[PDB]
């Protein structure tokens, strides 16, 4: 923003005015005054780093401008406006951030690094990467059954199209010690909920194959072979293949079953079929026969599986709180709060003090509130919000102002001497689940040069 | 919702990443007491 | 997906660090851990 004091009616001041604005939200409602206008009407300028050298800048258009003629005992402590030179002023500070960070709630409440991690896990999460996925043949992809737009949010999200394609779920969290399974960074997750469909996800994979050609006319072929000279086939059960050498969508494939029958003539039946990767298992979902420039039969098959949260599976909030499940329990065994409610998650209290991620702590309060009021809480970067400012709102609702609640030990039903910080929190289900890593071997494929066990769990290696 | 900005070569969606290329600047530095060199001026030279 | 689109790379004198000039142009917290940390940045 440009500040040029050229205001014959006082001190220095922003060239843009509440009129320019209302004249913008006027174009907003119609979904003629664009960005290009604010620029060709000299009110905003494109300042690189070099020029930035020779200018001064204001943080907030207000606070850092008017006069000085009382101050909240809860908010933060911002310095002063000791200067009447301000050439320009920042639209908003939270614009120093980048894509990733802009999802992190209350980032201005975390040990600097705790954000740096969360700026790498949000990339290992699951959601909806597009909406045309029911029509995409990309190798590997995860969709979260029931996505939920996070309770706690950031004004920055509106442009990151978040409320349209989220990547997690607002789960009724419970920070406490229980069985002892949520220990050292892993949670106890309500099974019940897991059943009612919590965190269930989809998993699509898709193999591919063409019909290689040779100028001197020799062609591979999509058929359903069987012995007849060569013998070189596959262990899998061919039986599932139709005649075109493809599995029809409805089928339930598993082990090393065949998915594509193909043959290569050599001087007669050498196989080139594609079997479902040894470990996976599921249901076909969509095949498709196409041509590729050279006139080759091109074919992509896609298999879909539904993965349920299990015990080894990894999870995480939005504060580098990565942790995995240790055990699932049911409402019977689950610790409950008189109201009736019970948690979906149960992270151990210890994972806080040294991580020093209070933001995560706050999101709970902000969400437990906007969960009742239904007013999409705002947890955007540096703003005018407080903890005190919320404890008031939660109190206006009947539940203790700090979040805690009384709860009764599910096994007996006796009260829990202490109280637990209970309430929602967004949690991302990041890929990398257990049954995709569990791996064992007692002799098997052996390398050829070395004669030592082969590498990778994929090849049965050691 | 797709925002493009990437290409589509032999099937796959390829993204060209920004290639950064501070440099060309003079600075003087005091060196530890245990050393023959007193001060030095550096400059990272590189073709834009 | 977005994030990946706004990414930056930097071959090979204290780069990795977070510079002042880096303010407002590049993100301060978004960068890969270890290895090539601070060589790859996000706008």
């Amino acid at each position: 923003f440009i500040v040029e004091d050229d205001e014959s009616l006082g001190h220095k001041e922003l060239k843009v005015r509440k009129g320019h604005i209302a004249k913008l939200m006027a174009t907003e409602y119609q979904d003629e005054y664009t960005w290009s206008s604010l620029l060709n009407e000299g009110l905003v300028e494109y300042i690189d780093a070099e020029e930035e050298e020779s200018i001064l800048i204001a943080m907030q258009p207000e606070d850092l401008e008017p006069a000085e003629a009382d101050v909240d005992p809860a908010k933060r402590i911002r310095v002063s406006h000791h200067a009447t030179t301000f050439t320009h002023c920042e639209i908003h500070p939270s614009m120093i951030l980048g894509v990733a960070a802009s999802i992190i709630p209350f980032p201005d409440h975390n040990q600097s690094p705790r954000n740096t991690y969360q700026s790498a896990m949000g990339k290992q999460a699951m959601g909806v990467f597009l909406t045309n996925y029911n029509v995409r043949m990309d190798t590997m992809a995860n969709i979260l059954y029931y996505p939920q737009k996070p309770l706690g949010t950031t004004r920055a999200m509106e442009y990151l199209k978040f409320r349209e394609l989220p990547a997690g779920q607002n789960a009724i969290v419970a920070i406490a010690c229980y069985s002892g399974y949520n220990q050292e960074d892993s949670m106890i997750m309500n099974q019940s909920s897991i059943d009612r469909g919590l965190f269930r996800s989809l998993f699509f994979r898709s193999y591919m194959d063409q019909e290689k050609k040779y100028g001197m006319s020799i062609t591979e072929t999509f058929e359903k072979p069987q012995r007849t000279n060569t013998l070189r086939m596959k262990h899998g059960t061919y039986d599932k293949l139709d005649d075109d050498g493809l599995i029809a969508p409805g089928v339930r494939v598993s082990g090393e079953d065949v998915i594509i029958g193909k043959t290569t003539p050599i001087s007669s039946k050498r196989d080139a079929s594609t079997p479902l990767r040894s470990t996976e298992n599921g249901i076909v979902d969509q095949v498709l026969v196409t041509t590729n420039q050279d006139g080759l039969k091109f074919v992509k098959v896609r298999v879909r599986t539904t993965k349920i949260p299990q015990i080894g599976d990894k999870f995480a909030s939005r504060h580098g709180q990565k942790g995995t499940i240790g055990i699932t329990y049911r409402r019977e065994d689950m610790p409950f709060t008189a109201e009736g409610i019970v948690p979906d998650l149960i992270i151990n209290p210890h994972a806080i003090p040294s991580r020093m991620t209070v933001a995560h702590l706050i999101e709970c309060l902000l969400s437990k509130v906007a969960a009742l009021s239904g007013n999409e809480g705002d947890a955007s970067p540096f703003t005018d919000i407080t903890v005190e400012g919320i404890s008031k709102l939660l109190r206006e609702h009947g539940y203790q102002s700090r979040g805690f609640e009384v709860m009764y030990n599910g096994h007996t039903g006796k009260k829990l001497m202490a109280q637990i910080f209970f309430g929602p929190t967004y949690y991302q289900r990041l890929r990398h689940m257990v049954d995709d890593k569990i791996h064992a071997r007692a002799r098997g494929p052996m390398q050829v040069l070395t004669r030592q066990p082969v590498e990778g769990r994929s090849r049965d290696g050691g | 919702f797709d925002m493009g900005g990437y290409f589509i070569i032999n099937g796959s969606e390829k993204v060209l990443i920004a290639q950064e290329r501070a440099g060309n600047i003079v600075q003087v530095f005091k060196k530890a007491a245990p050393s023959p060199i007193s001060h030095v001026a550096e400059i990272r030279s590189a073709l834009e | 997906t977005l994030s990946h689109l706004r990414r930056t790379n930097t071959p090979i004198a204290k780069p990795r660090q977070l510079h002042n000039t880096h303010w407002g142009l590049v993100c301060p917290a978004e960068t890969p851990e270890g290895q090539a940390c601070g060589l790859v940045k996000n706008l």
Binding site: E13, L14, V16, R17, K18, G19, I21, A22, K23, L24, M25, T27, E28, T34, W35, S36, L38, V44, Q60, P61, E62, E65, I91, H92, M95, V99, R155, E158, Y159, L160, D384 | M3, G4, G5, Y6, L16, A18 | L2, L5, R6, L43
Partner: peptide, 30 residues
């Protein structure tokens, strides 16, 4: 008064306008 100050909440409106024309992918495009 189409020529008075500008409070916090206002700024957003602008930013909104920014991405309206720009898009998070400007760079790559332009």
């Amino acid at each position: 008064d189409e020529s008075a100050p500008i409070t916090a909440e206002d700024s957003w409106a602008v930013i909104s306008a920014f991405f309206r024309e720009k898009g998070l992918v400007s760079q790559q495009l332009d």
